[PDB]
Amino acid sequence: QLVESGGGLVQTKTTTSVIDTTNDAQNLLTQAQTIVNTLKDYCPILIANTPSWQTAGGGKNSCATFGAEFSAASDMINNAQKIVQETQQLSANQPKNITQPHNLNLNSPSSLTALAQKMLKNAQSQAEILKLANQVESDFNKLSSGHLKDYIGKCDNNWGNGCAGVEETQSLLKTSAADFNNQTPQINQAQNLANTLIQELGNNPFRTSAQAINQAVNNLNERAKTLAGGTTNSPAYQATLLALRSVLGLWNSMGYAVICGGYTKSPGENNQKDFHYTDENGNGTTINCTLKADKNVSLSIEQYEKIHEAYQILSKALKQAGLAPLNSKGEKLEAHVTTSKYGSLRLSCAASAAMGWFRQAPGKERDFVAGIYWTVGSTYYADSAKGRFTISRDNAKNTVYLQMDSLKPEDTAVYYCAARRRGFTLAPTRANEYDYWGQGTQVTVSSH
Ligand SMILES: [Cl-]
């Protein structure tokens, strides 16, 4: 009479990527950038004890609530990227010392002008690195003052809280930046000395001892060494680390609340993907990804994939390898990126006025799932099925189908196809309104 097919255990795919990367600043800054740029450029809507910003901006797109936070985070990464580039400048301009000032075979006017030029490039780079480092601190205050005041610095499910060590590095940055601002006259005294040399040793178309200059070269070189290769004492390293810890903190504080999974290919698509997050201590969470993915509405699964991958690299790098000194090549890092997804199912039912699908769980009653009208092909769905399941019928084959998308373990039950030959006013949704029943087909959903 009614014979079901298409049941069974739904396919589960668990995919793990092993990313062999490095802890060098430029690589980490690119990961931080992926996270902040996708957020400030595509503004996804925020999901409607919960935080202060969530009540205010729930259903109200990000960028309206976190526009200042995203701008602060973006500026921190851009300025840290400039710090990394200036530390490259700084490493390329290391002035050498004067050996035997009395001898002028080697201590030539061309050599001293070349010495003064480097002192000039080196001093100017130091000034720019420090300027940028103070601006990252300024941009951090802008980030830590708004909605995320109570959250970004705090940590104790860890979602909603910073958990990035942003407070510890702000303090080390303030102390490092202070010491470097104390040594400003000494880098001024080397800068004017270099400007007097380029001038004096220069051509005159109209016709400050060696130790003192060696003092200036030694001071510049020692300061530059700590600025480029230092950690605890470098405001360059602390500013770049604060930028990295702030983006990680930004994602931990509000990333869970971002709407993801908007349709790219076509509306109502089995794209649903679970993104796995692991905290230290092994506390694992998973974020799941019906509307079009577009700016100010949603994030496509590809967009979330790229944030999730950047986050895993950034997290592992910051948590377990640390940031490598700005002038060092950087050590290897192995990051793990895990995602999972369930397959779809298509129940079929061959018969030989209305046809429906029912589900019954162990010990629980027969619940209506979906129904279809025999001539018109009008369909009705139970609230559980609505949007996920689709009922259809092949008039010719006298078959009814149930496309099952967006499956979750809760859907595990025996699925029955049912038929009513007699007429009706109100669409039949109760089991007593159906006269013919199929054998039943077990459908099993479970996480790996
Ligand atoms: Cl009836």
Short mmCIF file of C-alpha atoms and ligand atoms in Angstrom, two decimals:
data_model
loop_
_atom_site.label_atom_id
_atom_site.label_comp_id
_atom_site.label_asym_id
_atom_site.label_seq_id
_atom_site.Cartn_x
_atom_site.Cartn_y
_atom_site.Cartn_z
CA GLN A 1 0.00 0.00 0.00
CA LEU A 2 2.57 2.69 1.11
CA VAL A 3 6.25 1.70 0.92
CA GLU A 4 8.95 4.02 2.31
CA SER A 5 12.56 4.32 1.07
CA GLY A 6 15.30 6.83 1.77
CA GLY A 7 15.73 6.37 5.52
CA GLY A 8 18.80 5.46 7.59
CA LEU A 9 21.75 7.09 9.23
CA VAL A 10 22.41 10.61 7.88
CA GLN A 11 26.01 11.19 6.63
CA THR A 12 28.32 13.17 8.94
CA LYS A 13 31.46 14.89 7.71
CA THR A 14 34.13 16.06 10.18
CA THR A 15 36.94 17.94 8.51
CA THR A 16 40.22 18.98 10.22
CA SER A 17 42.87 21.15 8.57
CA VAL A 18 46.42 21.14 9.90
CA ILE A 19 47.97 24.53 9.01
CA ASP A 20 51.77 24.69 9.24
CA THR A 21 52.41 28.44 9.59
CA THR A 22 54.75 30.81 11.59
CA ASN A 23 54.52 33.27 14.51
CA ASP A 24 56.09 36.13 12.60
CA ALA A 25 54.26 39.44 13.04
CA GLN A 26 53.34 39.98 9.36
CA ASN A 27 51.69 36.53 9.13
CA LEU A 28 49.75 37.08 12.40
CA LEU A 29 48.73 40.66 11.37
CA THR A 30 47.27 39.20 8.08
CA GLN A 31 45.12 36.81 10.26
CA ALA A 32 44.00 39.65 12.56
CA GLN A 33 43.22 41.73 9.41
CA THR A 34 41.02 38.96 7.87
CA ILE A 35 38.89 39.00 11.12
CA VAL A 36 38.51 42.81 11.49
CA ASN A 37 38.17 43.63 7.74
CA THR A 38 35.38 41.06 7.07
CA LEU A 39 33.49 42.51 10.10
CA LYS A 40 33.88 46.24 9.30
CA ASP A 41 33.34 45.68 5.51
CA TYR A 42 30.32 43.31 5.65
CA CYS A 43 28.65 44.39 8.97
CA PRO A 44 26.66 41.16 9.77
CA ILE A 45 23.53 41.43 11.95
CA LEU A 46 23.88 40.63 15.71
CA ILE A 47 21.82 37.69 17.12
CA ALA A 48 18.59 38.94 18.81
CA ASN A 49 23.20 37.01 32.04
CA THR A 50 23.51 38.57 28.50
CA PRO A 51 25.81 41.60 27.76
CA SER A 52 24.88 45.33 27.52
CA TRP A 53 25.62 45.71 23.76
CA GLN A 54 23.55 42.54 22.90
CA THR A 55 20.26 43.99 24.24
CA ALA A 56 20.94 47.40 22.51
CA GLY A 57 22.10 45.96 19.14
CA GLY A 58 20.22 42.63 19.00
CA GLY A 59 18.93 42.34 15.43
CA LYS A 60 20.63 45.68 14.75
CA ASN A 61 23.60 45.14 12.36
CA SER A 62 27.19 45.41 13.70
CA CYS A 63 28.94 48.52 12.47
CA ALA A 64 26.07 50.43 14.00
CA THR A 65 26.86 49.24 17.48
CA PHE A 66 30.63 48.36 17.02
CA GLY A 67 31.66 50.81 14.25
CA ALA A 68 34.09 52.61 16.63
CA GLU A 69 35.43 49.26 18.01
CA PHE A 70 36.00 47.90 14.45
CA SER A 71 37.67 51.18 13.38
CA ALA A 72 39.93 51.13 16.51
CA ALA A 73 40.87 47.44 15.91
CA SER A 74 41.48 48.09 12.15
CA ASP A 75 43.69 51.14 12.89
CA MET A 76 45.70 49.11 15.47
CA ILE A 77 46.45 46.39 12.88
CA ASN A 78 47.34 48.95 10.15
CA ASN A 79 49.67 50.92 12.45
CA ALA A 80 51.29 47.65 13.74
CA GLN A 81 51.81 46.70 10.05
CA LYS A 82 53.56 50.10 9.61
CA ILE A 83 55.65 49.39 12.82
CA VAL A 84 56.81 46.03 11.25
CA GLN A 85 57.75 47.88 7.96
CA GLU A 86 59.67 50.61 9.85
CA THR A 87 61.55 47.96 11.90
CA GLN A 88 62.67 46.69 8.39
CA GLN A 89 63.82 50.27 7.64
CA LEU A 90 65.55 50.39 11.03
CA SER A 91 67.41 47.11 10.43
CA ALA A 92 68.63 48.34 7.01
CA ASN A 93 70.05 51.56 8.48
CA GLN A 94 72.56 50.58 11.21
CA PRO A 95 75.31 53.29 11.34
CA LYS A 96 78.91 51.92 11.80
CA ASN A 97 81.55 53.46 14.16
CA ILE A 98 84.54 55.75 13.44
CA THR A 99 87.87 53.83 13.81
CA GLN A 100 90.99 56.09 14.12
CA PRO A 101 89.58 59.63 13.46
CA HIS A 102 93.08 61.08 12.74
CA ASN A 103 93.45 58.84 9.61
CA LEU A 104 91.58 60.34 6.63
CA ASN A 105 92.35 57.66 4.01
CA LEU A 106 89.32 55.73 5.28
CA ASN A 107 87.58 58.47 7.24
CA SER A 108 86.80 60.21 3.97
CA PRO A 109 84.14 63.00 3.47
CA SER A 110 82.08 60.45 1.44
CA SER A 111 82.21 57.94 4.40
CA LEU A 112 81.20 60.50 7.09
CA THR A 113 78.26 61.80 4.97
CA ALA A 114 77.16 58.10 4.52
CA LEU A 115 77.47 57.66 8.33
CA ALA A 116 75.36 60.83 8.91
CA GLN A 117 72.74 59.62 6.40
CA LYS A 118 72.21 56.36 8.27
CA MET A 119 72.03 58.10 11.61
CA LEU A 120 69.36 60.21 10.00
CA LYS A 121 67.39 57.28 8.61
CA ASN A 122 67.77 55.30 11.87
CA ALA A 123 66.65 58.22 14.10
CA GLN A 124 63.64 59.07 11.84
CA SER A 125 62.51 55.39 11.84
CA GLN A 126 62.74 55.25 15.68
CA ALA A 127 60.62 58.46 15.88
CA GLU A 128 57.99 56.99 13.46
CA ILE A 129 57.91 53.58 15.25
CA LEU A 130 57.31 55.39 18.60
CA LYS A 131 54.67 57.72 17.03
CA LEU A 132 52.76 54.66 15.68
CA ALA A 133 53.20 52.78 19.01
CA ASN A 134 51.55 55.67 20.91
CA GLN A 135 48.70 55.66 18.33
CA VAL A 136 48.09 51.87 18.83
CA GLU A 137 47.79 52.63 22.60
CA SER A 138 45.42 55.56 21.76
CA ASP A 139 43.34 53.24 19.43
CA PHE A 140 43.27 50.59 22.21
CA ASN A 141 41.75 53.15 24.64
CA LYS A 142 39.08 53.89 21.95
CA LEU A 143 38.38 50.07 21.72
CA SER A 144 38.44 49.45 25.55
CA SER A 145 36.19 52.52 26.35
CA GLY A 146 33.04 51.60 24.41
CA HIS A 147 30.63 48.65 24.74
CA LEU A 148 33.48 46.19 25.43
CA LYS A 149 34.80 48.11 28.56
CA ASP A 150 33.78 45.41 31.09
CA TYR A 151 34.45 42.51 28.65
CA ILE A 152 37.62 42.91 26.44
CA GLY A 153 40.06 43.08 29.42
CA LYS A 154 38.25 40.50 31.58
CA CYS A 155 38.36 36.67 31.39
CA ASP A 156 37.29 33.90 33.85
CA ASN A 157 32.00 28.76 27.88
CA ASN A 158 34.41 31.77 27.80
CA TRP A 159 32.55 33.64 24.96
CA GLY A 160 31.56 37.26 25.65
CA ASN A 161 34.87 37.97 27.48
CA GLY A 162 38.18 39.10 25.93
CA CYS A 163 40.44 36.23 27.18
CA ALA A 164 43.42 37.70 25.31
CA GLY A 165 45.81 39.20 27.94
CA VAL A 166 45.13 42.67 26.55
CA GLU A 167 45.50 44.36 30.03
CA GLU A 168 49.00 42.86 30.73
CA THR A 169 50.43 44.03 27.34
CA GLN A 170 48.80 47.50 27.60
CA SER A 171 50.79 47.96 30.90
CA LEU A 172 54.08 46.68 29.32
CA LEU A 173 53.43 49.02 26.30
CA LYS A 174 52.85 52.09 28.57
CA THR A 175 56.10 51.38 30.53
CA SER A 176 58.17 50.67 27.31
CA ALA A 177 56.77 53.77 25.48
CA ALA A 178 57.57 55.91 28.59
CA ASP A 179 61.28 54.79 28.75
CA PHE A 180 61.67 55.46 25.04
CA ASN A 181 60.14 58.98 25.43
CA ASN A 182 62.73 59.57 28.27
CA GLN A 183 65.53 58.85 25.70
CA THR A 184 64.16 61.41 23.10
CA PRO A 185 66.87 64.20 23.64
CA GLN A 186 69.67 61.63 22.98
CA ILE A 187 68.09 60.68 19.58
CA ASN A 188 67.63 64.44 18.92
CA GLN A 189 71.32 65.08 19.79
CA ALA A 190 72.24 62.38 17.20
CA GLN A 191 69.79 63.80 14.61
CA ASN A 192 71.05 67.44 14.69
CA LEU A 193 74.71 66.13 14.78
CA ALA A 194 73.94 64.20 11.53
CA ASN A 195 72.35 67.29 9.95
CA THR A 196 75.49 69.36 10.79
CA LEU A 197 77.70 66.66 9.12
CA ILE A 198 75.71 66.44 5.80
CA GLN A 199 75.89 70.28 5.68
CA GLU A 200 79.62 70.76 6.66
CA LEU A 201 81.18 67.86 4.61
CA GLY A 202 79.15 69.01 1.58
CA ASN A 203 80.21 70.83 -1.61
CA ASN A 204 80.49 74.67 -1.64
CA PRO A 205 79.89 75.92 -5.25
CA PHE A 206 80.80 79.46 -4.11
CA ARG A 207 84.57 78.70 -3.70
CA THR A 208 81.35 67.44 17.49
CA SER A 209 84.46 65.17 17.90
CA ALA A 210 84.76 61.51 16.70
CA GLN A 211 83.95 60.29 20.21
CA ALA A 212 80.92 62.58 20.40
CA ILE A 213 79.63 61.17 17.07
CA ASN A 214 80.58 57.62 18.28
CA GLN A 215 78.45 58.34 21.35
CA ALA A 216 75.50 59.21 19.09
CA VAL A 217 75.99 56.08 16.88
CA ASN A 218 76.25 53.78 19.98
CA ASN A 219 73.11 55.33 21.59
CA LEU A 220 71.09 55.02 18.33
CA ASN A 221 72.30 51.42 17.79
CA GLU A 222 71.57 50.26 21.38
CA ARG A 223 68.08 51.85 21.35
CA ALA A 224 67.30 50.45 17.88
CA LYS A 225 68.39 46.91 19.03
CA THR A 226 65.84 46.91 21.90
CA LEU A 227 63.17 48.56 19.65
CA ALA A 228 63.57 45.96 16.85
CA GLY A 229 64.61 42.81 18.72
CA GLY A 230 63.20 43.37 22.19
CA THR A 231 60.00 42.08 23.79
CA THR A 232 59.26 43.33 27.36
CA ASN A 233 61.22 46.60 26.70
CA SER A 234 60.12 47.28 23.08
CA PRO A 235 57.04 49.55 22.58
CA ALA A 236 57.19 48.37 18.92
CA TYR A 237 56.70 44.69 19.93
CA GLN A 238 54.17 45.54 22.66
CA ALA A 239 52.11 47.75 20.25
CA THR A 240 52.09 44.95 17.56
CA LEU A 241 51.21 42.30 20.25
CA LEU A 242 48.44 44.55 21.72
CA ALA A 243 46.95 44.90 18.18
CA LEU A 244 46.99 41.04 17.79
CA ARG A 245 45.63 40.38 21.31
CA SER A 246 42.90 43.06 20.77
CA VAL A 247 41.52 41.40 17.55
CA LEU A 248 41.51 37.99 19.35
CA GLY A 249 39.78 39.70 22.30
CA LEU A 250 37.32 41.44 19.91
CA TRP A 251 36.31 38.07 18.36
CA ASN A 252 35.98 36.35 21.75
CA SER A 253 33.92 39.29 23.16
CA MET A 254 31.34 39.58 20.29
CA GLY A 255 32.09 37.01 17.45
CA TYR A 256 29.56 34.40 18.70
CA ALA A 257 26.72 36.98 18.18
CA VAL A 258 27.47 37.42 14.41
CA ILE A 259 24.86 36.11 11.90
CA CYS A 260 26.51 33.71 9.39
CA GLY A 261 25.19 31.25 6.82
CA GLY A 262 23.46 33.55 4.31
CA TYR A 263 22.80 32.06 0.83
CA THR A 264 25.44 32.58 -1.88
CA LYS A 265 24.29 30.10 -4.61
CA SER A 266 20.43 30.03 -4.00
CA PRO A 267 17.71 30.60 -1.26
CA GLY A 268 17.01 27.76 1.19
CA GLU A 269 20.21 25.73 0.73
CA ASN A 270 21.76 22.79 2.73
CA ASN A 271 24.93 24.90 3.49
CA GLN A 272 24.60 24.58 7.36
CA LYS A 273 28.23 24.09 8.68
CA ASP A 274 29.39 23.78 12.32
CA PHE A 275 32.64 25.62 13.20
CA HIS A 276 34.59 24.16 16.13
CA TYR A 277 36.20 26.35 18.79
CA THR A 278 38.43 24.99 21.49
CA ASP A 279 39.52 27.04 24.48
CA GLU A 280 42.47 26.09 26.78
CA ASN A 281 41.55 23.37 29.29
CA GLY A 282 39.68 21.73 26.36
CA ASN A 283 36.35 23.59 26.79
CA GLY A 284 35.01 23.09 23.27
CA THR A 285 32.12 25.05 21.71
CA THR A 286 30.64 24.95 18.17
CA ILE A 287 28.96 27.77 16.14
CA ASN A 288 26.43 26.86 13.46
CA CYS A 289 26.15 28.65 10.04
CA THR A 290 17.98 31.52 5.22
CA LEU A 291 18.62 35.05 3.86
CA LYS A 292 20.98 36.38 1.21
CA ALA A 293 24.59 36.88 2.36
CA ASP A 294 25.33 40.52 1.62
CA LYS A 295 26.81 43.66 3.25
CA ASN A 296 24.76 44.81 6.36
CA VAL A 297 22.80 41.50 6.53
CA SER A 298 24.81 38.21 6.73
CA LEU A 299 28.19 36.47 6.35
CA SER A 300 28.58 33.68 3.75
CA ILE A 301 29.94 30.33 5.03
CA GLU A 302 33.21 31.10 2.98
CA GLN A 303 33.50 34.41 4.83
CA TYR A 304 33.04 32.74 8.23
CA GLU A 305 35.45 29.89 7.15
CA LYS A 306 38.17 32.52 6.57
CA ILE A 307 37.50 34.28 9.96
CA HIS A 308 37.40 30.88 11.78
CA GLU A 309 40.73 29.78 10.12
CA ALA A 310 42.40 33.20 10.85
CA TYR A 311 41.17 33.00 14.44
CA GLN A 312 42.56 29.43 14.93
CA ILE A 313 46.00 30.45 13.61
CA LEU A 314 45.96 33.73 15.64
CA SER A 315 44.77 31.91 18.85
CA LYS A 316 47.35 29.04 18.57
CA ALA A 317 50.14 31.52 17.68
CA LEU A 318 49.36 33.90 20.55
CA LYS A 319 48.61 31.17 23.12
CA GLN A 320 51.39 28.67 22.35
CA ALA A 321 54.25 30.07 20.22
CA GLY A 322 53.91 33.78 21.21
CA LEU A 323 54.77 36.68 18.88
CA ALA A 324 58.33 36.44 17.46
CA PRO A 325 60.60 39.56 17.97
CA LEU A 326 59.89 41.99 15.06
CA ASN A 327 63.36 41.49 13.53
CA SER A 328 63.33 37.63 13.78
CA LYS A 329 62.25 35.23 11.07
CA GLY A 330 59.77 33.36 13.23
CA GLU A 331 59.30 29.77 14.36
CA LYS A 332 56.95 27.08 13.08
CA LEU A 333 53.41 26.75 14.31
CA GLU A 334 50.88 24.02 13.71
CA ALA A 335 47.23 25.17 13.91
CA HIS A 336 44.16 22.89 13.76
CA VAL A 337 40.92 24.07 12.09
CA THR A 338 37.91 21.76 12.62
CA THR A 339 34.44 21.98 10.98
CA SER A 340 31.61 19.49 10.66
CA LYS A 341 28.34 19.06 8.70
CA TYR A 342 25.40 16.68 8.36
CA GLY A 343 24.13 15.36 5.07
CA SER A 344 20.57 15.68 3.76
CA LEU A 345 18.06 12.81 3.25
CA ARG A 346 15.19 12.24 0.85
CA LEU A 347 12.43 9.99 2.07
CA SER A 348 10.27 8.57 -0.69
CA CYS A 349 6.91 6.82 -0.42
CA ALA A 350 5.29 4.80 -3.19
CA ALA A 351 1.51 4.22 -3.14
CA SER A 352 -0.47 1.61 -5.25
CA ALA A 353 -6.83 13.55 -1.47
CA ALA A 354 -3.83 14.34 0.82
CA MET A 355 -0.51 12.62 1.69
CA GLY A 356 1.56 13.40 4.74
CA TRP A 357 4.70 12.54 6.76
CA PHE A 358 4.70 11.80 10.49
CA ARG A 359 7.53 11.15 12.98
CA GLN A 360 7.61 9.16 16.20
CA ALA A 361 10.55 9.22 18.62
CA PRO A 362 11.15 6.36 21.20
CA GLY A 363 8.19 6.39 23.63
CA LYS A 364 6.79 9.65 22.14
CA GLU A 365 3.52 9.87 20.08
CA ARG A 366 3.19 10.20 16.20
CA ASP A 367 3.78 13.87 15.36
CA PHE A 368 2.83 15.49 12.04
CA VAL A 369 5.84 16.69 9.95
CA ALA A 370 4.60 17.80 6.49
CA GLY A 371 1.56 17.32 4.25
CA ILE A 372 0.57 17.93 0.62
CA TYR A 373 -2.81 18.29 -1.18
CA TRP A 374 -3.47 15.65 -3.86
CA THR A 375 -4.47 17.80 -6.86
CA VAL A 376 -3.26 21.34 -6.24
CA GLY A 377 -0.02 20.31 -4.55
CA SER A 378 -0.50 22.71 -1.63
CA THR A 379 1.79 22.04 1.28
CA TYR A 380 1.59 22.43 4.99
CA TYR A 381 4.40 22.05 7.51
CA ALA A 382 4.77 21.55 11.25
CA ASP A 383 6.84 24.34 12.88
CA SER A 384 9.82 21.90 13.28
CA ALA A 385 9.80 21.09 9.50
CA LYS A 386 9.08 24.68 8.26
CA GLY A 387 12.08 25.99 6.35
CA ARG A 388 14.17 22.79 6.69
CA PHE A 389 11.97 20.02 5.16
CA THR A 390 10.21 20.08 1.78
CA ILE A 391 7.28 17.85 0.79
CA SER A 392 6.68 17.09 -2.90
CA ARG A 393 4.78 14.50 -4.91
CA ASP A 394 5.27 12.83 -8.30
CA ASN A 395 1.64 12.50 -9.53
CA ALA A 396 2.69 10.00 -12.25
CA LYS A 397 4.59 7.56 -9.92
CA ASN A 398 1.99 8.06 -7.08
CA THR A 399 5.00 8.88 -4.83
CA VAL A 400 5.40 11.48 -2.01
CA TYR A 401 8.89 12.78 -1.01
CA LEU A 402 10.40 14.48 2.04
CA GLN A 403 13.61 16.42 1.46
CA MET A 404 15.29 16.70 4.84
CA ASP A 405 17.86 19.53 5.10
CA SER A 406 19.26 21.35 8.20
CA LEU A 407 19.19 18.05 10.16
CA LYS A 408 20.11 17.83 13.85
CA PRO A 409 20.19 14.86 16.29
CA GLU A 410 16.73 15.91 17.61
CA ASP A 411 15.25 14.61 14.22
CA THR A 412 16.12 10.95 14.96
CA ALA A 413 12.77 9.07 14.82
CA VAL A 414 10.74 6.59 12.77
CA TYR A 415 9.20 8.47 9.81
CA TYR A 416 5.83 7.31 8.48
CA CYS A 417 4.11 8.23 5.26
CA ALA A 418 0.33 8.49 5.48
CA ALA A 419 -2.60 8.91 3.02
CA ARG A 420 -6.27 10.07 3.24
CA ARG A 421 -8.61 9.15 0.35
CA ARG A 422 -11.73 10.97 1.69
CA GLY A 423 -12.23 14.74 1.27
CA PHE A 424 -11.65 17.55 3.75
CA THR A 425 -12.09 21.25 4.41
CA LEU A 426 -9.17 21.83 6.77
CA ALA A 427 -5.85 20.27 5.70
CA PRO A 428 -5.40 16.99 7.68
CA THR A 429 -2.59 17.29 10.27
CA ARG A 430 -3.71 14.74 12.91
CA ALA A 431 -2.90 10.98 12.58
CA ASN A 432 -6.65 10.16 13.00
CA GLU A 433 -7.28 12.10 9.71
CA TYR A 434 -5.14 9.61 7.75
CA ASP A 435 -6.43 6.12 6.65
CA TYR A 436 -3.35 4.50 5.02
CA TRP A 437 0.04 4.16 6.67
CA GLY A 438 3.47 3.06 5.47
CA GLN A 439 5.73 0.47 7.26
CA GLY A 440 7.89 3.24 8.81
CA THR A 441 11.53 4.13 8.20
CA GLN A 442 14.13 4.82 10.88
CA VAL A 443 16.07 8.07 10.40
CA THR A 444 19.17 8.51 12.60
CA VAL A 445 21.05 11.82 13.21
CA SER A 446 24.12 12.03 15.48
CA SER A 447 27.34 14.11 15.86
CA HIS A 448 30.73 12.37 15.31
CL CL B 1 -12.40 13.78 9.82
#
